[PDB]
Each structure stands twice: as C-alpha cells, then as structure tokens.
Amino acid sequence: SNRQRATGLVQAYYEAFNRGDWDAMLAFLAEDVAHDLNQGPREIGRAAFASFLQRMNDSYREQLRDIVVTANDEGTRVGAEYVVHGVYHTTDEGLPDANGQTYVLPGGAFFDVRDGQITRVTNYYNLQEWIAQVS
Amino acid sequence: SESNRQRATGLVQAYYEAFNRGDWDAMLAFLAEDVAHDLNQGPREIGRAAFASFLQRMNDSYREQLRDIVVTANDEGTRVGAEYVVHGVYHTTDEGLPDANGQTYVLPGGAFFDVRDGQITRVTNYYNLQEWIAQVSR
Ligand SMILES: [Cl-]
Ligand SMILES: [Cl-]
Ligand SMILES: [Cl-]
Ligand SMILES: [Cl-]
C-alpha cells in the first residue's frame, strides 16, 4: 500500500518533469521541501524549487528515460535511477556558446515521502561527465 | 517478489555492514566477477581486482563509518538504491587532494546497484564532492 503510494508519487513527479509541467511537480512537494542540488547547495521550499526549474529551462531542455524506482516497505524512502537526455540550447554561464549540443548520461535521486508529499529531493549525477559532453 | 526485494536489499545491507566492520573480504564475496564500480564524479573501474585495490587505497587515506543506512529495491529485485551518512576522517594524504591532517567530515551519500542472482554487478556511488572538499579544507 504505502510502497505503491510512494513510488506512484515519484513516478507522477517525473512524468510532470518530462512534460514540462512545473506546477504539477511543485504540487507534489511539501511547502518546506529540501532540495539538494547536485554538487551544490541545499535549497528549502517550493519557491526555490520553482526558480530552479525555470532557471534550468532557460538554458537546457531534458527528459528522463529508463526511470527505475525503488522504495522501502514503509513507503517513506524512494530511490530513482534514470538516464537524462537533453539539449543545451541557450548559452549558460561557465560554458561554451550553446549550439544544440546534446547530452545523455545517467543520474539518480532520492526522496523522503512523508504525510502524503515529497519532503526532500536529493539529486545526483556525474557533473564532470556532463561538463565534458556539453563541452 | 517480496522475496526478490528481500534478496536484493539483504545483499546490499550485508555489503554495507561489512564495510562498517572493515570486512573487505566479505564485501568482495558479494561482488560478481564482472562488477562495474562507478566512482563519484570519476571513472568506472571493472572487476574484483580493481575493487580490492580501491578498498586498499581508500583505507590508506580515510577511515569511515556509515550510519542511517536505508536500502530500497524494485519488485524485480534487480535494482537497489541506498542512502547513508558517512562519518569519516582524512588521515593520510590522497593523490590530488589537500594535505591530510586528521580532518573530519560528515555528509550524506547514496548508491545504486545492479543485483543478478544474489551478486552485486554494479556499484554506482554518489555524494556532494564539493561539500566534501569544503569540509576537509575548512
Ligand atoms: Cl540537481
Ligand atoms: Cl566513490
Ligand atoms: Cl558520479
Ligand atoms: Cl551532490
């Protein structure tokens, strides 16, 4: 029960991401959601999270394929591993000029699911690899 | 299916218990001969020989304990995710890092695993390397 409700939540979060439906993503998150950026800071709350998504989309556009979701029996901890496919479309800081450069690389994330909502998103990938691909 | 999950989570939990004991031989026993090891922000290393040398190189510079270990699996029992908090000490300088002087660090980490017939065939380890470097350099 709880394991299904937890993995379902995370799957819906990722479907929303893959559609570009940021509002729908945000609806799954607690007001004080903790978001650990890869090789970056912890940011608290939906406002920061919305800003993050908007900022990412200003330069990149991605989808997550081959999402494999794992959970505990309590349905309180979820892992997801994925393959991100994307394009670097509009030049970003600390990178060469955008050219439609494509990237494909694995990533993964972990989630706390509490009181019917995602209370933490901790994201990981090999940033050195990503750098190398987008040049 | 419940049992597939139990098999996968049990293997991975045992692997981490072994790590906390410093039981490298047990860790190696849980790995397949074709194991792929993805170092965080680093290269892939293939095979048990490489994994044995990796454990040796790491023990030479760092002392670590994993706490708050949480292991999760898919229903097929073929993929496992794990999270933990490492509590560590940098005691002997490591190729390409600041000088070691006994600096402590405490930070989360996570890993993903492929499990095939009761052996680990992939260990993909992640953590915030920037945060780790900031702690050991503080
Ligand atoms: Cl991120
Ligand atoms: Cl690593
Ligand atoms: Cl990595
Ligand atoms: Cl990170």
- Overall structural domain count of chain A: 1
Bound molecules: chloride ion
Task: Tell me the number of strands of chain A.
Answer: 6
Oligomer classification: homodimer
The H-and-E topology of chain A, N to C, reads as HHEEHEEEEH
CATH topology of chain A: Nuclear Transport Factor 2, Chain: A
Estimated radius of gyration of chain A: 15 Å
Distance between the termini of chain A: 45 Å
**Largest interface, C-beta within 8 A:** A-B, 23 and 23 residues
In the sheet with the most strands of chain A, the strands line up as 2-1-6-5-4-3
Largest sheet of chain A: 6 strands, mixed
Secondary structure: helix percent of chain A = 25-40%
CATH architecture descriptor of chain A = Roll
| Main CATH class of chain A | Alpha Beta
Helix count of chain A? 4
Give the structural class of chain A: alpha+beta
**Proportion of residues in extended strands of chain A:** 35-45%
Shape of chain A: globular
Domain SnoaL-like (chain B): 12-123
InterPro entries (chain B): CHP02096 (IPR011721), NTF2-like_dom_sf (IPR032710), SnoaL-like (IPR037401)
Protein name (chain B): SnoaL-like domain-containing protein
In short:
Chain A has 135 residues and is of the alpha+beta class. The first copy, chain A, has helices spanning 2-19, 22-27, 46-59, 127-134; strands at residues 29-36, 42-44, 60-71, 77-88, 101-114, 117-125.
Question: How would you describe this protein?
Answer:
The structure is a homodimer. Chain A is an alpha+beta fold and 135 residues long. Chain A has a single domain, classed as Nuclear Transport Factor 2, Chain: A. In chain A, 34% of the residues lie in helices and 43% in strands. Chain A has four helices and six strands, in the order H-H-E-E-H-E-E-E-E-H. Chain A has helices at residues 2-19, 22-27, 46-59, 127-134; strands at residues 29-36, 42-44, 60-71, 77-88, 101-114, 117-125. A six-stranded mixed beta sheet of chain A has the order 2-1-6-5-4-3, sandwiched between helices. The longest helix of chain A has 18 residues, at 2-19. Chain A is globular. Chain A binds chain B through residues 36, 38-40, 68-72, 77-81, 106, 108, 110, 122, 124-128, and chain B through 38, 40-42, 70-74, 79-83, 108, 110, 112, 124, 126-130. One chloride ion binds at residues 37-38, 123 of chain A. Residues 38-39, 124 of chain A line the site of one chloride ion.
